[PDB]
């Protein structure tokens, strides 16, 4: 064997797993790593284009290598947590706000 | 928008993606790369706050 002389030519016996959608998971499409909800798309790609982007270079699309289908990216829901309190002196109840 | 754009900058690190540095580097060498990215992004956030 030899290395560090030319671009690699034999690499990567790759195993594939099943595809799941509508539940946010970790994904890996040709080295594109990230987390989020995968769902069906309506945007149409040109034949040679792999994955789309937005105004702020955020990956909001991807193409499945095997079945040649366009999927979206939508992050797992998140937000701040707020506690509404009437004062520790007056009472000991609270009301919680998910924003 | 600019606050987001600052994410796509190496700031002197090997790669601007946080995961790709640790994917192909041992802990105590990638530590300095992560520490460089952290301070770059922290300064980019302080500017926006000011």
């Amino acid at each position: 064997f030899e290395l560090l002389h030319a671009p690699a030519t034999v690499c990567g016996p790759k195993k594939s797993t099943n595809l799941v959608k509508n539940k946010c998971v970790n994904f890996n499409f040709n080295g594109l790593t990230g987390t989020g909800v995968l769902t069906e798309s309506n945007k149409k790609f040109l034949p040679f284009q792999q994955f789309g982007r937005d105004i702020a270079d955020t990956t909001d699309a991807v193409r499945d290598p095997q079945t040649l289908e366009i999927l979206d990216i939508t992050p797992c829901s998140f937000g701040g947590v707020s506690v509404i309190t009437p004062g520790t002196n007056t009472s000991n109840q609270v009301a919680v706000l998910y924003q | 928008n600019t606050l987001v754009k600052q994410l796509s900058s190496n700031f002197g690190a090997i790669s601007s993606v946080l995961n790709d540095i640790l994917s192909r580097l041992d802990p105590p060498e990638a530590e300095v790369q992560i520490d460089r990215l952290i301070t770059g992004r922290l300064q980019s956030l302080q500017t926006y706050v000011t």
Binding site: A56, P75, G80 | -
Partner: peptide
């Protein structure tokens, strides 16, 4: 449905307030 006058409508249609979801990716809330 919104009890706004005529000039208020003309003033509201002259200012244009997805970018929001694009910025929402990295913990930016409005």
């Amino acid at each position: 449905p919104s009890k706004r006058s005529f000039i208020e409508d003309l003033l509201f249609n002259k200012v244009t307030l997805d970018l929001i979801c694009a910025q929402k990716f990295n913990g930016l809330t409005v």
